[PDB]
């Protein structure tokens, strides 16, 4: 097929490349609409439907079946977020930040925002609780690196809030996910391993002040943790990265 | 701040032997070792493997192809273990010369051994493809891995099976040396004008770059939202948490549009798969349809003059 | 009363003191060497 | 009162990094001079003492 | 004081605040810019000490006579070669 | 138009330079101080590209090319029609790329999350800056930068590649290619594995992350894990960028012959030198 | 005349910092535009 | 006319930011275009006028 | 009474008046500059 | 006719921004197209007409 | 009396009238410019 | 009133007067620089 | 004494003493070596 052309200089190669462009436009349409199964329809800044919705219409509903008798999930769901957010707009126009109306960390807004997940523990493939204290797992042991248990924990101001007393591990993926802190405040606390640095003398948490440690979102039980509790704890620390940054030295 | 790049403390319990969802357990080995130098980066368990009919057959055919390439090297070294080691990268098992066309009648040390080895290499990759399919089927999973592997195999087969047949000569297939197949790539671009002016070579590069860039972006995104239960990507697909939301809002605020937890993997799947799919198309058209991509670009208005 | 690095306040002072001494000696000896290599082969 | 920085930053990492940087800077300045056939103390010696 | 100035002094406190702020912005910009210029000048200086064959590479860009904006239609940077 | 969960994340804070002066959104896009600078740099660079195109003879967007100054100008600023437009665009490009990263930092600070994304993009920026700044400064001429054009910068890639014979024989180039190929393979496998678990065979419940560990352990004997695959993809891509930049930096600065002759250290080892 | 009301919409601290940045950037544009012209470069 | 009602539609903070960006960009572009033309480059024109200024 | 920005009609009028004074000053300077440039080197 | 009812469909802010962007890009493109053509490049034409202006 | 934008019928009318005045002013300036350009360098 | 910045009317006037003083000082120094350059190397 | 290096102050002095003895011994051997090389083939 060399030198033999359709249409007067339109080749099998020209045909192939134009065919690819057509297919790729269709694939971009497909990919974009697949990626619209969360967060749509667009809202306005008062919780009502937005005037504009974009060139791409929403995809057809798709269902996920969940193992271990945890029902079905269909998306896009067209539902609005199932939590109230203690903000208030700073301008009558659009495109400007909304300001917290109370304590941003206690209310759960901004970088401290939590999503309303189900109040049940995430499960492993065998239907057991996926993240548990090692007192429950009981076959897990420290394999390498330094064990943080017994070390003092130091907040983002250089003050010690307590000691590491327990690790919470993921039994499916063999990982430590939380450090249980016993507080001199008087109670206990879970700290995400992703937010703690273990050193020889202490575990240092550079996101949360010592006063913040007095109010960390609690868990109902000390043998399992729900996805909602996980969201609240991790959101509290990630929000501290903004709302506690002034307590740092200097 | 802890960058989730390396694990701080490793932990280990009973070794995990796998899910049982229709896998023939007697084809799954039983021995795992736990290697902590890997546990700094990823999992420490060197787990069991599954070994059934397809895997055994694929390994036999591939190992025999490997062996035959090695034997050819030994023979062309004139038996010298010194030349064999000195030329481990510079030697190749080359296809038959052009005068033999597509016939199976070329001397054993001038393409015949190349043909035999190529046949067994063909057999093993197809059996490995069937393996990728059947391991998914035995667990009840979708077939995305096998489809993605089919795209890469398509580039492989246009390289040495489809295009040499359409050109009428085994002599255009790629040799089995480390340095000689790079020489083959350079020669291929040089004989077909310049392969930069091949639009499907351009599109293949775009998807290679984009797949590298996309997985820089996605790995960085997941690591950045790891403070939240971020890398548990499954279960964020069905129960959206703040990790998925903040990941979406980062890219929405940055570039004006975002993906979803499930859908970023479709983008990556398609960008990765389209690299060999589009590349194979461009090689197939080279020589068969276009002889000189430079003059073709000049005629099609994207090379000057 | 524990720090981020584990140093106490006192260890920090003496460490900073010796750090300044080390830098002072490095710069002074470098100055001397530049003087010598200027008197030898002027540039 | 600057010493408080050593309560924040680990002196071990900082000291090693600064040492490596100064060492490489000195090494590459020396390589400049030895590459330059005007200072090049070795070769010029082979002319000052006539191969010494 | 829920305002970065309240009493203000109306001519001197405000003037010092404004001088401090504008000088801060200009000074950080100056630091960044001169650091970058120094880095480039240092790289050029270092390149002076590379082997002479670092100056043998030909011009790597093709002038296509349809992109040649020098003034003359010749397919090259005129007045040089 | 906000996503149905977006409102609770649109709070003040996280900025680096100008406080609440630019702390607002324009449609989806966060602006901030570096959004202003990135928009200005991007617009000025695009608009100088268009102006340079106007001075040529084609409006075909595949033939437009802005060329670096000739070598005779060295590292000086060229007359604006003799390479100066290229230098203006290059400075605008650096300004916009750096501003884009700083804007990404501010968005990460507002949504309190790690800074991995601007870090990775900075690796991409470093590859670009190696191409247009670092290497031409060491060689002593801006004209060793690559011409700006959809198909003419490929002419640059070609000419520079064939200056050192076949560029394949560049060990850092080999390392970079392997990292590009491997990151593409890893993206394919990771996307496929996620999709297979989330989209099972018809009628089956959704698969668990145990099933996907099991899938790779069955297929190859090893599973890096969910956290591990993202660390791996990130570092693979970053290393590909860095070793590509080292590849090109070495060529013409410290190595000058055909790259094939570099391996003569192995081929001329004295025991098998003469064989 | 009434241009002082600009400070009712834009906070003066931030504007001062931003203006310092902008003025330095404008200066560098002008200086190296001058360096581009052979007849106005003062280095040589 | 009664164009003042633009300020019932567009907020002044963002409008002023966008206006400043656009106006400075347009001024820089026009000056650059004039510098690139060898009939309106004032530096070279003055070079010729005074015999090297 | 349509108001997106939150202003009243009076504040919009006052704001527009000041804005127009600024715009007219800028345009007057630009007109003077163009007249000077046209005398110096006409382009039509 | 009664085209005002477009404002019951489209938001004025989005439409005005889109219109401004469109008009700016259109005007830029037309001027650039004129300047690239040496029959409507006013700078060079004036150079010719006034004997190098 | 429903609308996508939330504007009332009266608000849309005054909006449209002001917008039309603006468009007509723009168009009349463009028309004068085109007459000038056509007298100077006719393109048809 | 229309106060985004939280200033009062009187604070804005005083800060504007200070800003004007600083800006005229900057312009006067710039004028001296331009006169020196023009004497040295005139560009018009 | 869970110090960062697990040592004590008393152990620190003796370890530093043997360190300084070795260091000065190495430096003295180096200086006499440089003296010999300078006499043999001055640079
Ligand atoms: C002088 C050299 C030429 C050139 C000539 C070619 C040629 C010739 C080809 C390419 C191809 C490719 N080129 Mg090139 N190319 C050049 C310049 C470039 C530049 C550059 C910056 O200059 C870049 C980035 C690229 C990039 C690319 C890729 C996008 C593309 C391959 C895609 C792919 O999937 O590959 C990786 C995937 C594969 C190789 C598929 C096969 C792998 C199989 C599946 C492996 C299975 C297992 C195996 C059998 C056994 C071992 C396993 C055991 C465990 C041990 N080219 C210049 C112009 N290029 C190819 C293409 O698609 O072109 C359109 C191709 O054939
Ligand atoms: C004749 C040609 C030569 C050759 C000569 C060269 C030369 C010369 C070079 C390479 C380089 C590379 N080559 Mg080679 N190469 C050849 C053959 C190959 C083959 C092959 C199969 O044959 C392959 C796979 C490769 C592969 C590669 C990569 C390792 C590398 C390019 C990646 C890179 O730099 O990313 C780096 C990424 C970037 C620079 C991108 C930066 C992006 C910036 C930050 C953002 C831009 C935004 C944009 C303006 C925005 C637009 C806005 C829109 C809204 C989107 N080469 C042959 C043998 N190759 C290059 C390299 O290593 O470069 C460092 C290089 O210079
Ligand atoms: C989307 C496109 C990308 C991609 C996709 C892709 N590749 C894939 C997959 C996918 C989705 C798989 O599912 C499949 C896989 O299983 O991956 C883990 C595969 C895979 N891609 C691979 C490689 C690969 N992919 C490449 C490319 C890419 N693959 C693309 C970039 C490349 C490149 C860039 O060149 C390579 C080299 C393999 C890891 C794997 C396929 C496994 C396979 O082919 O097995 C066949 C087996 C053999 C040839 C047997 C070899 C046996 C040994 C030599 C035995 C040694 C024995 C002893 C040492 C002695 C030997 C000699 C004698 C004495 C015996
Ligand atoms: C799990 O997480 C993940 C997601 O999310 C859940 C994701 O989304 C993504 C993101 C990835 C995708 C959505 C997939 C598709 C993305 C690509 C293929 C990457 C390539 C994208 C482009 C083609 C880039 C184009 C976008 C750009 C550059 C935007 C351009 C905008 C401007 C130039 C102007 C910006 C506007 C500003 C600053 C306004 C300023 C206002 C003033 C007045 C000043 C990733 C990685 C992710 O892993
Ligand atoms: C051939 O030679 C030449 C070169 O090459 C050697 C050159 O490189 C260059 C110079 C190079 C360039 C033009 C590109 C690189 C330029 C820079 C490095 C400087 C960068 C400039 C900026 C980023 C400034 C951008 C400023 C903007 C967008 C204006 C901001 C305006 C607002 C935000 C709105 C108004 C402000 C507000 C909100 C408050 C109101 C203000 C009050 C005073 C009150 C030139 C000219 C040259 O010719
Ligand atoms: C001066 C010239 C300017 C252009 C020339 C530059 C070259 C362009 C080539 C690549 C195109 C890049 C342009 C990307 C546009 C960025 C703006 C943007 O995408 O955001 C706008 C839009 C709105 O977002 P949203 O409202 O959320 O959409 C869903 C609601 N219905 O968001 C969307 O549209 C969502 C759809 C996403 C679009 C998919 C992106 C495809 C990129 C794949 C390219 C890879 C292959 C490229 C091959 C290159 C070959 C040379
Ligand atoms: C340039 C001249 C026009 C800008 C001058 C005035 C800008 C004022 C600041 C601003 O942009 O306002 C934000 C604008 C309006 O959004 P506001 O968020 O409306 O409230 C939503 C109510 N539904 O936010 C937006 O919604 C902006 C988007 C409006 C619709 C834009 C349609 C596409 C934009 C042009 C197409 C893309 C091309 C971009 C440039 C291409 C360059 C090659
Ligand atoms: C193509 O390239 C080139 C660049 C050739 C041509 C480009 C031309 C262009 C586009 C040029 C753009 C020019 C512009 C937009 C210039 C804008 C200049 C401005 C607005 C300058 C304003 C300066 C204001 C200052 C310095 C204010 C200082 C205020 C203070 C409070 C400082 C405090 C200190 C004192 C002493 C205050 C005085 C107080 C008392 C009591 C005396
Ligand atoms: C190619 O490069 C050219 C050649 C251009 C020019 C070269 C330029 C150079 C070389 C620049 C660099 C100069 C440098 C690096 C100077 C720095 C010298 C240093 C770091 C000296 C420090 C020495 C410490 C010493 C000598 C201690 C030595 C011995 C002991 C402590 C005893 C035995 C050793 C050990 C480790 C055991 C510990 C001992 C006990 C008792 C426990
Ligand atoms: C030969 O090459 C060819 C290739 C050049 C390239 C293209 C050729 C083509 C296809 C050209 C097509 C051009 C088009 C489609 C042109 C259309 C232009 C339009 C629609 C211009 C409209 C301008 C409208 C304006 C300026 C409207 C209003 C301005 C105002 C100031 C009105 C203010 C509005 C207010 C105050 C509303 C506030 C009211 C209330 C009640 C709050
Ligand atoms: C100590 O024992 C031994 C002897 C192990 C020492 C061994 C040394 C070894 C094993 C050396 C092996 C070295 C190398 C360099 C192996 C890798 C070579 C490369 C670069 C291979 C890349 C190949 C690329 C492609 C596209 C290959 C094949 C593609 C196909 C589509 C295969 C099918 C093609 C044909 C013609 C099948 C023929 C079928 C019939 C019926 C004739
Ligand atoms: C070759 O030709 C090319 C290719 C150039 C293409 C041509 C492109 C062009 C020229 C495109 C268009 C340019 C356009 C359409 C428009 C430019 C409009 C301008 C110059 C607008 C300038 C306005 C200046 C102003 C408004 C100055 C304002 C200063 C002030 C102090 C105003 C203060 C304002 C207020 C509201 C104070 C606050 C009051 C209260 C009560 C809060
Ligand atoms: Fe992922």
From TrEMBL, chain A:
SUPFAM superfamilies the UniProt entry points to: Photosystem II reaction centre subunit H, transmembrane region, PRC-barrel domain
A single GO cellular-component term on record: plasma membrane light-harvesting complex
Residue ranges of every copy of the Photosynthetic reaction centre H subunit N-terminal domain listed in the record: 5-136
InterPro entries: Bac_photo_RC_H_C, Photo_RC_H, Photo_RC_H_N, Photo_RC_H_N_sf, PRC-brl_dom, PRC_barrel-like_sf
Keywords: Membrane, Transmembrane, Transmembrane helix
Superkingdom: Bacteria
Record's protein name: Photosynthetic reaction center subunit H
Organism: Phaeovulum veldkampii DSM 11550
Gene name of this polypeptide: puhA
From TrEMBL, chain E:
Record key words, sorted: Membrane, Transmembrane, Transmembrane helix
Domain of life: Bacteria
Record field: transmembrane: 26-46
Keyword Membrane applies: yes
Pfam families assigned to the protein according to its UniProt record, in alphabetical order: RhodobacterPufX (PF11511)
Entries under InterPro entries matching the protein: Intrinsic_membrane_PufX
Descriptive protein name: PufX
Natural source organism: Phaeovulum veldkampii DSM 11550
TrEMBL record, chain F:
Binding site for bacteriochlorophyll a 1: 153
Keyword entries, A-Z: Bacteriochlorophyll, Chlorophyll, Chromophore, Electron transport, Iron, Magnesium, Membrane, Metal-binding, Photosynthesis, Reaction center, Transmembrane, Transmembrane helix, Transport
GO cellular component, one term: plasma membrane-derived chromatophore membrane
Source domain of life: Bacteria
One Pfam family recorded for the sequence: Photo_RC
GO terms (BP aspect): photosynthetic electron transport in photosystem II
Listed CDD domains: Photo-RC_L (cd09290)
Binding, Fe(3+): 190, 230
Compartment(s) where it occurs, according to its Swiss-Prot or TrEMBL record: Cellular chromatophore membrane
Entries under Gene3D superfamilies matching the protein: Photosystem II protein D1-like
Binding-site residues for bacteriochlorophyll a 2, renumbered to this chain: 168, 173
Membrane topology: Multi-pass membrane protein
Family: Belongs to the reaction center PufL/M/PsbA/D family.
Functional description taken from the UniProt entry: The reaction center is a membrane-bound complex that mediates the initial photochemical event in the electron transfer process of photosynthesis.
Stored NCBIfam families: pufL
Name of the protein this chain belongs to: Reaction center protein L chain
Biological source species: Phaeovulum veldkampii DSM 11550
Automatic annotation (TrEMBL), chains I, K, L:
Residue positions binding bacteriochlorophyll a: 34, 43
Gene Ontology biological-process entries: photosynthesis, light reaction
Cellular compartments per GO CC: plasma membrane; plasma membrane light-harvesting complex
Entry annotated with the keyword ATP-binding: no
Bilayer-spanning residue ranges: 18-40
Origin: domain of life: Bacteria
Chain sites annotated for binding a bacteriochlorophyll: 16, 34
Keyword tags: Antenna complex, Bacteriochlorophyll, Cell inner membrane, Cell membrane, Chlorophyll, Chromophore, Light-harvesting polypeptide, Magnesium, Membrane, Metal-binding, Transmembrane, Transmembrane helix
Membrane topology: Single-pass type II membrane protein
Chain segments annotated as coiled-coil in the UniProt record: none
Gene3D superfamilies: 1.20.5.250
InterPro entries documented for this protein: Antenna_a/b, Antenna_beta_CS, Antenna_beta_dom_sf, LHB-1/5, Light-harvesting_complex
Quaternary structure, from the entry: The core complex is formed by different alpha and beta chains, binding bacteriochlorophyll molecules, and arranged most probably in tetrameric structures disposed around the reaction center. The non-pigmented gamma chains may constitute additional components.
Function: Antenna complexes are light-harvesting systems, which transfer the excitation energy to the reaction centers.
Name recorded for this polypeptide: Antenna pigment protein beta chain
Protein species of origin: Phaeovulum veldkampii DSM 11550
């Amino acid at each position: 097929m060399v030198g033999v052309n359709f249409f007067g200089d339109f080749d099998l190669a020209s045909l192939a490349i134009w065919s690819f462009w057509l297919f790729f436009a269709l694939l971009v349409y497909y990919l974009q609409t697949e990626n619209m199964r969360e967060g749509y329809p667009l809202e306005n800044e008062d919780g009502g439907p937005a005037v504009n919705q974009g060139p791409f219409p929403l995809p057809s509903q798709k269902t996920f079946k969940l193992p271990h008798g945890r029902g079905e999930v269909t998306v896009p769901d067209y539902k609005k977020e199932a939590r109230d957010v203690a903000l208030a707009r700073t301008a009558v126009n659009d495109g400007f930040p909304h300001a917290p109306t109370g304590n941003p960390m206690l209310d759960g807004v901004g970088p401290a925002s939590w999503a309303p997940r189900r109040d049940i523990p995430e499960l492993d493939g065998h239907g057991h609780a996926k993240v548990v204290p090692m007192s429950v797992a009981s076959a897990f042991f420290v394999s390498a690196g330094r064990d943080p248990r017994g070390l003092p924990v130091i907040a983002n101001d250089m003050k010690t809030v307590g000691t590491v007393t327990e690790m919470w591990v993921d039994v499916a993926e063999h990982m430590v996910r939380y450090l249980e802190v016993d507080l001199a405040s008087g109670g206990k606390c879970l700290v995400p391993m992703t937010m703690a640095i273990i050193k020889k003398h202490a575990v240092v948490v550079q996101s949360i002040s010592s006063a913040a440690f007095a109010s960390v979102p609690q868990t109902k039980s000390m043998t399992e943790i729900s996805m909602l509790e996980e969201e609240k704890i991790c959101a509290y620390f990630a929000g501290g990265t903004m709302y506690c940054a002034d307590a740092k030295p200097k | 701040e802890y960058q989730n790049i390396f694990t701080q403390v490793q932990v280990a319990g009973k070794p995990e032997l796998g899910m049982v969802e229709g896998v023939n357990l007697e084809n799954r080995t039983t021995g795992t070792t736990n290697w902590p130098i890997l546990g700094w980066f990823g999992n420490a368990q060197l787990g069991p493997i599954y070994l059934g009919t397809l895997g055994t057959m694929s390994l036999i055919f591939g190992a025999f192809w490997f062996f035959l390439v090695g034997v050819s090297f030994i023979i062309q070294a004139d038996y010298s273990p010194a030349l064999f080691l000195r030329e481990l990268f510079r030697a190749g098992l080359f296809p038959p010369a052009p005068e033999y066309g597509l016939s199976l009648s070329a001397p054993l040390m001038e393409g015949g051994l190349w043909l035999i080895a190529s046949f067994f290499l063909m057999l093993s990759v197809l059996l490995w493809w069937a393996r990728t399919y059947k391991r998914a089927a035995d667990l009840g999973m979708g077939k995305h891995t096998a489809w993605a592997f089919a795209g890469a195999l398509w580039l492989m087969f246009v390289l040495s099976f489809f295009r040499p047949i359409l050109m009428g000569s085994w002599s255009e297939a790629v040799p089995y040396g480390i340095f000689p197949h790079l020489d083959w790539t350079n020669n291929f671009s040089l004989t077909h004008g310049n392969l930069f002016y091949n639009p499907f070579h351009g599109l293949s590069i775009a998807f290679l770059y984009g797949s590298t860039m996309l997985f820089a972006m996605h790995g960085a995104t997941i690591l950045a939202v790891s403070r939240l239960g971020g890398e548990r990507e499954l279960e964020q697909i069905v129960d959206r948490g703040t990790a998925a939301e903040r990941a979406a809002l980062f890219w929405r605020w940055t570039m004006g549009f975002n993906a979803t937890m499930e859908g970023i993997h479709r983008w990556g799947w398609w960008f990765a798969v389209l690299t060999p799919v589009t590349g194979g198309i461009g090689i197939l058209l080279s020589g068969t349809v276009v002889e000189d991509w430079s003059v073709w670009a000049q005629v099609h208005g994207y090379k000057a003059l | 009363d524990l720090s981020f690095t584990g140093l106490t306040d006192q260890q920090a002072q003496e460490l900073h003191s010796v750090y300044l001494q080390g830098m002072w000696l490095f710069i002074s000896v470098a100055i001397v060497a530049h003087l010598a290599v200027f008197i030898w082969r002027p540039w | 009162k600057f010493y408080k920085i050593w309560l924040i930053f680990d002196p071990r990492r900082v000291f090693v990094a600064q040492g490596v940087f100064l060492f490489l800077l000195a090494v590459m300045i020396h390589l400049m001079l030895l590459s330059n056939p005007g200072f090049n103390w070795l070769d010029i010696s082979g002319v000052k003492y006539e191969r010494v | 004081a829920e305002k970065h100035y309240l009493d203000g002094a109306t001519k001197v406190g405000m003037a010092t605040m404004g001088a401090a702020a504008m000088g801060k912005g200009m000074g950080i910009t100056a630091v960044v810019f001169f650091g970058t210029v120094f880095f480039v000048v240092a790289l050029a200086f270092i390149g002076q000490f590379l082997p002479d064959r670092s100056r043998e590479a030909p011009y790597p860009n093709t002038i296509f006579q349809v992109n040649d904006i020098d003034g003359t239609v010749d397919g090259k940077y005129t007045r040089f070669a | 138009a906000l996503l149905s969960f977006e409102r609770k994340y649109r709070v003040p804070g996280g900025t680096l330079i100008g406080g609440n002066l630019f702390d607002f959104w324009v449609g989806p896009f966060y602006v901030g101080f570096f959004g202003v600078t990135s928009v200005f740099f991007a617009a000025l660079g695009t608009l100088m590209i268009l102006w340079g195109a106007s001075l040529g003879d084609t409006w075909n967007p595949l033939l437009i090319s802005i060329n670096p100054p000739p070598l005779e100008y060295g590292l000086g600023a060229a007359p604006l029609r003799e390479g100066g437009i290229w230098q203006v665009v290059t400075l605008c490009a650096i300004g916009a790329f750096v501003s884009w990263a700083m804007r990404e930092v501010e968005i990460c600070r507002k949504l309190g999350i790690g800074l991995h994304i601007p870090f990775a993009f900075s690796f991409a920026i470093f590859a670009y800056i190696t191409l247009v700044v670092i290497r031409p400064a060491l060689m002593g001429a801006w004209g060793h930068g690559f011409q700006y054009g959809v198909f003419t910068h490929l002419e640059w890639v070609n000419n520079v590649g064939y200056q050192y014979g076949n560029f394949h024989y560049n060990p850092l180039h080999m390392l970079g290619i392997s990292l590009f190929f491997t990151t593409t393979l890893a993206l394919g496998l990771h996307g496929a594995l996620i999709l297979s678990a989330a989209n099972p065979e018809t009628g089956k419940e959704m698969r668990t992350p145990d099933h996907e560990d099991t899938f790779f352990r069955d297929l190859v004997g090893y599973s890096v894990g969910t956290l591990g695959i993202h660390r791996l993809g990130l570092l693979l891509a970053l290393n590909a960028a860095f070793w590509s930049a080292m590849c090109i930096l070495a060529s013409g600065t410290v190595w000058f012959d055909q790259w094939v002759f570099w391996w003569d250290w192995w081929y001329n080892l004295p025991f098998w030198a003469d064989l």
